[PDB]
């Protein structure tokens, strides 16, 4: 069977080799180094591939999986909020998906600023947050939506749709079903916003680096990778892209931890199976 | 005014761009293609989004607008009736809303079989039609109700409540007041039937692809989309979902013609205004 134990063990074997190869050495030239000064990485061992880095002072990467273009990042550190908002505004972000829970954000020990549910001033940037719809995803998991309006003197004002999975559970994986519902919602939100930009003749439409959904959880490697994998499977342009391809691509373009847990890879396996998409490359 | 000429012009503009982007190319990969064979699309330019298609041999789509889950389809071709009945039964359809007029049905040149007002045999499926209540909706518009009992050897017998509005003319919008009364009746009918299935511990309750109201008119883009929009505004879970959201969601999940006529979009605007719901996204 293409989705049996033997196939799963082979997929695991190829991915483990790749994680090992991509493990960051001290002062690794493959990875962004703090430039710095200020702490760049939220976690010491969770680093940001230099050649696909979005900004020199964020832990954030452009990732293309097949045809699917995204940005994946860590939850921005306190010091990084201005730069983070500048990334969001410059990208003409069509959806920001935050997969860290309300309980994580509320936990002062974790240093995850509640930057999208309240208004605020961050250096030369001001941000206004407004609550919009709430969408159930299944299993009682809820997406709370917002718009963030980012203002800065001498810059165009940009509003960004936010999808926040406020009760992502901390003790269990989220199911493939909830994952698929979340990828659909995030993709739909992006498509509505991207359409507005296309309608106005935005020059961002022509720029490979712009109009990318931005996805973060806490480290930007576990929950983030599970959603990015599900989004690439939702994309009609990605026929025949294997699970091995998707995960290898996320790993090379961000770090070797992308899809951090077995349960996360299992979701991607189950979604692929549902589509009759291959796990392994021939 | 957020409901004035300027707002409405901007809404139309965004919706037009989307329709144009969604236009099906010859052999478009975003859309379901005829599997042979028999005609799939009742109208060659009214196509069925592949990623949300219900069955490979029907022009029919799962649509979720905010939290509201439905199925929208074209009036089934004769050769599609058997598959159409199998969709209805497998979905444990809580209500089937038919918005095609008695005149259209009667017009033999339109090829719209009278599949719900009479009993019949469709391959291995037998269907028994029984008339139930009649509910007036305003402006002399009438909802005629039925119960379709679908039987097939070795399969569970399923009964489907039908709401047929036989006097909503093709290419028109009934008033916002009639639309609101029809959405209430359709939602109420589904609620009663869904309750029955829950009382019996039906497995369909847990399944997101099942228990969806099914709505069709002739093409499944005009009158259908007006009703679906009204149903989503009747759903208490959809606070702050904009008209721009609702229509963009219907378009991405079926085709770019959803909400075919200005007058239909006008009913949705008028219903939104009545609720202080936004027309546009920020
Ligand atoms: O490795 N980590 O540093 C790490 C820490 C906490 C997380 O919750 C996590 O998972 S993640 O946020 O889904 O990527 C990853
Ligand atoms: O868009 N169309 O090409 C189309 C064709 C026939 C219809 O009868 C129609 O109207 S509809 O049945 O209310 O969707 C729409």
From Swiss-Prot, chains A, B:
Catalysed conversion reaction: O-phospho-L-tyrosyl-[protein] + H2O = L-tyrosyl-[protein] + phosphate
Record's signal peptide: none
Molecular function via GO: protein tyrosine phosphatase activity
Protein EC: 3.1.3.48
Main location: secreted
Tyrosine-protein phosphatase domain sequence ranges: 1-275
Location in the cell: Secreted
Catalytic residues (positions): 217
UniProt entry keywords in alphabetical sequence: Hydrolase, Plasmid, Protein phosphatase, Secreted, Virulence
Family as reported in the entry's similarity comment: Belongs to the protein-tyrosine phosphatase family. Non-receptor class subfamily.
Function, in words: Essential virulence determinant. This protein is a protein tyrosine phosphatase. The essential function of YopH in Yersinia pathogenesis is host-protein dephosphorylation. It contributes to the ability of the bacteria to resist phagocytosis by peritoneal macrophages.
Protein's recorded name: Tyrosine-protein phosphatase YopH
Organism in which the protein naturally occurs: Yersinia enterocolitica
Lineage summary: Bacteria, Pseudomonadati, Pseudomonadota, Gammaproteobacteria, Enterobacterales
Encoding gene per record: yopH
Shown residues within the full chain: 187 to 468 of 468
